[PDB]
Amino acid sequence: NECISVKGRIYSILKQIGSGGSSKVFQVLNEKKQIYAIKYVNLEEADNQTLDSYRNEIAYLNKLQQHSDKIIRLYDYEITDQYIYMVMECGNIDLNSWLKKKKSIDPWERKSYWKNMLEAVHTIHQHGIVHSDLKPANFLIVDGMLKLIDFGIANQMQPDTVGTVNYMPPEAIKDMSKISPKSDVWSLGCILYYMTYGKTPFQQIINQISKLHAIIDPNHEIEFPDIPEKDLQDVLKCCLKRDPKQRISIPELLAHPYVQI
Numbered sequence: 001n002e003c004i005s006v007k008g009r010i011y012s013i014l015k016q017i018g019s020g021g022s023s024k025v026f027q028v029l030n031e032k033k034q035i036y037a038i039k040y041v042n043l044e045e046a047d048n049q050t051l052d053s054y055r056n057e058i059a060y061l062n063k064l065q066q067h068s069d070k071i072i073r074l075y076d077y078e079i080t081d082q083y084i085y086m087v088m089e090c091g092n093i094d095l096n097s098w099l100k101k102k103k104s105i106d107p108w109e110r111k112s113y114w115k116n117m118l119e120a121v122h123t124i125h126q127h128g129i130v131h132s133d134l135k136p137a138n139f140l141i142v143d144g145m146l147k148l149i150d151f152g153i154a155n156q157m158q159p160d161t162v163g164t165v166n167y168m169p170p171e172a173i174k175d176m177s178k179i180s181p182k183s184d185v186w187s188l189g190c191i192l193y194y195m196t197y198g199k200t201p202f203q204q205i206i207n208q209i210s211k212l213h214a215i216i217d218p219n220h221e222i223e224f225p226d227i228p229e230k231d232l233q234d235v236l237k238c239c240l241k242r243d244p245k246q247r248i249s250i251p252e253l254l255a256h257p258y259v260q261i
């Protein structure tokens with residue numbers, strides 16, 4: 001029996017669903033037994049740039065509430081010099097844990113999930129935000145629809161019940177600015193590829209250094225096996241174009257036959 005108090009309201013912890021460096025996400029219940037997700041951030045041992053990323057993430061989450069329902073709802077928040085408490089809507093499961101369960105994915109559900117992802121990422125791009133680290137763990141399944149959890153400004157968190165380089169665009173590897181909204185298109189294309197063939201475009205390469213070479217290698221042809229949905233095979237080919245200027249954009253993806261027909 002452990003509780004959390006946010007802006008006068010008391011919440012009862014069900015379980016810890018996520019943990020990072022200084023952050024924790026809990027599944028909670030209010031006095032009316034309504035479910036919520038609370039993110040706790042310990043600021044006692046936090047630097048100026050780490051503090052600023054959490055401030056910028058809260059600000060953008062609050063602002064982008066009214067612009068799209070495909071962005072996680074932030075009902076309330078408490079921020080002091082010692083901690084951060086964020087009262088958010090609780091989802092059923094994240095897209096990474098849902099896809100790891102394998103099974104059979106319906107073409108109607110995959111198309112509906114892809115539309116939600118395009119809308120969420122489109123909304124953040126319109127307000128000058130480029131995620132740059134999109135992965136299925138950044139998306140949540142709530143009321144049968146996908147919702148974007150974070151905008152990639154603050155630190156990423158691991159589940160509770162090691163990250164990936166599979167969704168990293170070739171521009172980010174060719175660099176170290178070349179990062180633009182097109183970098184998120186590649187990462188979205190990798191998630192859709194995983195939703196279509198049951199694996200990411202470079203999942204066959206278990207080695208991580210040999211994987212990084214394959215993403216930037218033009219001779220390393222990405223396999224696109226034939227499927228009944230021909231419009232789906234085209235979006236995947238257009239999203240996974242190594243040249244960012246030749247790669248399809250979000251406004252072009254929203255007018256593509258795969259989401260319109």
Ligand SMILES: CN1CCC(Oc2ccc(-c3[nH]nc4cccc(OCC5CCCCC5)c34)cc2)CC1
Pocket residue numbers: 017018025037039072088089090091092093094097137138140149157158159160161
């Ligand atoms: C492994 N397991 C976990 C619980 C459950 O799935 C989730 C339920 C709720 C949620 C969530 N709701 N609101 C949320 C608001 C912010 C963050 C959130 O999670 C972050 C982190 C949680 C673990 C996976 C990566 C993202 C949030 C998310 C996963 C079933 C599977």
